[PDB]
Design an enzyme around this catalytic site. Structure first.
Site, short mmCIF file in Angstrom:
data_model
loop_
_atom_site.label_atom_id
_atom_site.label_comp_id
_atom_site.label_asym_id
_atom_site.label_seq_id
_atom_site.Cartn_x
_atom_site.Cartn_y
_atom_site.Cartn_z
N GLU A 25 69.12 82.21 65.99
CA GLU A 25 67.80 81.66 65.71
C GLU A 25 67.73 80.33 66.43
O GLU A 25 68.67 79.53 66.35
CB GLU A 25 67.60 81.45 64.20
CG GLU A 25 66.34 80.68 63.84
CD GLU A 25 66.17 80.42 62.36
OE1 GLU A 25 66.91 81.00 61.54
OE2 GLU A 25 65.26 79.65 62.00
N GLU A 60 59.46 72.60 64.27
CA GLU A 60 59.63 72.84 62.83
C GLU A 60 59.68 71.55 62.06
O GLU A 60 60.32 70.58 62.47
CB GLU A 60 60.96 73.58 62.56
CG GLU A 60 60.99 74.17 61.14
CD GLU A 60 62.29 74.83 60.75
OE1 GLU A 60 63.30 74.68 61.48
OE2 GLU A 60 62.30 75.49 59.69
C1 LIG Z 1 65.21 82.43 57.77
O1 LIG Z 1 64.52 81.28 57.75
C2 LIG Z 1 64.21 80.38 58.84
C3 LIG Z 1 65.02 79.09 58.72
O2 LIG Z 1 66.39 79.34 59.09
C4 LIG Z 1 64.49 77.90 59.54
O3 LIG Z 1 64.38 76.74 58.69
O4 LIG Z 1 63.23 78.07 60.23
C5 LIG Z 1 62.48 79.29 60.17
C6 LIG Z 1 61.00 78.97 60.35
O5 LIG Z 1 60.67 77.79 59.62
C7 LIG Z 1 62.73 80.02 58.86
O6 LIG Z 1 61.92 81.19 58.77
O7 LIG Z 1 64.56 83.50 58.48
C8 LIG Z 1 65.36 84.66 58.71
C9 LIG Z 1 64.56 85.64 59.57
O8 LIG Z 1 63.24 85.86 59.03
C10 LIG Z 1 65.78 85.25 57.36
O9 LIG Z 1 66.71 86.33 57.56
C11 LIG Z 1 66.43 84.18 56.49
O10 LIG Z 1 66.66 84.72 55.18
C12 LIG Z 1 65.58 82.92 56.38
O11 LIG Z 1 66.33 81.91 55.70
#
Ligand SMILES: *[C@@]1(O[C@@H]2[C@@H](O)[C@H](O)O[C@H](CO)[C@H]2O)O[C@H](CO)[C@@H](O)[C@H](O)[C@H]1O
Ligand SMILES: *[C@@H]1O[C@H](CO)[C@@H](O)[C@H](O)[C@H]1NC(C)=O
Length: 298
Positions: free
Chosen positions: A115, A120
Site C-alpha cells: 500500500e 492522506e
Molecule cells: C486499510 O486501510 C488503509 C490504511 O492502511 C491507511 O491509513 O490509508 C488508507 C486510506 O486512508 C486506508 O484505507 O485498507 C486495506 C485495504 O482496503 C484493508 O485491508 C485494511 O484492513 C485497512 O486497514
C-alpha cells in the site's frame, strides 16, 4: 527515468475507467460508500468538462441507528506496477471528522501486495502524510534524500501497529484547509523496483516541473528535483513487497484513525466524531475532492 502516457483521466473519463466501491468501510468509518449509479443520482460524484468532484452528503441529518454519511471510494479498473501517477488536485476534503485519501493498494491480498498512501490525513491536520504499508521485512533508513520528515521507519504492519512507514510533507499547504486556500497542487508518485518517491508541488509553485504541471505524454523524472518522500530499497525489497495495485481515491469519516477521541478532540473538533458527522450535514459542504486530472505513465 523516462516514461510515456498510459492513462489520461479527466472529467467523465473516470466514469468508465474507475468503479465506485460500495463496500463496508475497511477502516470502520461513519460512512456509507455508494455505488456509481447512486453517487451520480445523488450528485456525490460529478464528472464533466475538466472537473471530477467526489463529495460527501452535505444535506442529510443522519439517523444514529442508520448508515453513515454517504460518500464515495473510487478504484481504477487497471492495476499498475512500475509507473508514475500524477494527480492535479484543485481541492481535497476538509472538515472535522474527514479522512480523505489518494493511494494505491492490492485489496485482495492486503498487506502483502503493498500500500502506498500519496495524499492522506485526518481532521484537517496538516501536513500531508505519505506512507507505505507492507508485510514483513521492509524498513527505511534513518537518513535519505527527501524534503519531508520520516515519522516511523518500519513499514511492516505486523510489527509497527499498522502505522506503516511514514513521511510528513514539509509545508502546511500540502494538506487540508491550507492546501485548499492555496488552490491545491500536484502530487506525483514514481514506483520502480528500487524505490517509491512522492513529490508535492503547491499550485503556486514557481518550480513545479512542466512534466507534472502540464501533463505531456512523455516525462522524465530525472528532472523533477528531490522528492518530498523517498522510500529507497536499502532495507526493503520494494518489488517483492508490492504487486499490481489499483489507484483509490476516497473520503471516509471518523473510523480507526480520524474517529479516535484523542485525535478528533485533539484537533479541536467538538464532542464525538460520530455524533458530529451525524448531526452537522452543512459542515461537510467543503468535504469534496475537485480533481483536474489523474495521469498514469509507464
Ligand atoms: C486499510 O486501510 C488503509 C490504511 O492502511 C491507511 O491509513 O490509508 C488508507 C486510506 O486512508 C486506508 O484505507 O485498507 C486495506 C485495504 O482496503 C484493508 O485491508 C485494511 O484492513 C485497512 O486497514
Ligand atoms: C452537482 O454538483 C456540481 C459540482 O459541485 C454542481 O456544480 C451542480 O450544480 C450540481 N448539480 C445539480 C443538478 O444540482
Amino acid at each position: 527515468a523516462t516514461y510515456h502516457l498510459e492513462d489520461n483521466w479527466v472529467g467523465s473519463a473516470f466514469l468508465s475507467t474507475f468503479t465506485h466501491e460500495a463496500i463496508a468501510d475497511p477502516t470502520h468509518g461513519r460512512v456509507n460508500y455508494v455505488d456509481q449509479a447512486t453517487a451520480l443520482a445523488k450528485n456525490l460524484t460529478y464528472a464533466s468538462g475538466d472537473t471530477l468532484i467526489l463529495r460527501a452528503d452535505h444535506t442529510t441529518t443522519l439517523s444514529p441507528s442508520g448508515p453513515g454519511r454517504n460518500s464515495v471510494r473510487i478504484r481504477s479498473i487497471k492495476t499498475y506496477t512500475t509507473h508514475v501517477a500524477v494527480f492535479d488536485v484543485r481541492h481535497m476534503p476538509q472538515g472535522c471528522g474527514t479522512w480523505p485519501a489518494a493511494w494505491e493498494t492490492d485489496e485482495g491480498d492486503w498487506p502483502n501486495g503493498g500500500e502506498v498512501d500519496i495524499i492522506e490525513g485526518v481532521n484537517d491536520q496538516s501536513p500531508n502524510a505519505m506512507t507505505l504499508h507492507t508485510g514483513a521485512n521492509c524498513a527505511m533508513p534513518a537518513s535519505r534524500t527527501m524534503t519531508g520528515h520520516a515519522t516511523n521507519n518500519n513499514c511492516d504492519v505486523n510489527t509497527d501497529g499498522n502505522t506503516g512507514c511514514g513521511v510528513q510533507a514539509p509545508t502546511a499547504n500540502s494538506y487540508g484547509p491550507s492546501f485548499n486556500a492555496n488552490g491545491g497542487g500536484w502530487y506525483a508518485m514514481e514506483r520502480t523496483n528500487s524505490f517509491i518517491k512522492v513529490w508535492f508541488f503547491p499550485r503556486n509553485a514557481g518550480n513545479v516541473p512542466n512534466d507534472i504541471a502540464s501533463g505531456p505524454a512523455t516525462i522524465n523524472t530525472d528532472n523533477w528535483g528531490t522528492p518530498t518522500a523517498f522510500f529507497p530499497n536499502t532495507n526493503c525489497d520494494i518489488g517483492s513487497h508490492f504487486d499490481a495495485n489499483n489507484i483509490i481515491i476516497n473520503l471516509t469519516f471518523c473510523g480507526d484513525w480520524a474517529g479516535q477521541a484523542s485525535i478528533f478532540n485533539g484537533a479541536g473538533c467538538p464532542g464525538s466524531c460520530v455524533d458530529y458527522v451525524n448531526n452537522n450535514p452543512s459542515a461537510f459542504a467543503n468535504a469534496y475532492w475537485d480533481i483536474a486530472s489523474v495521469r498514469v505513465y509507464q
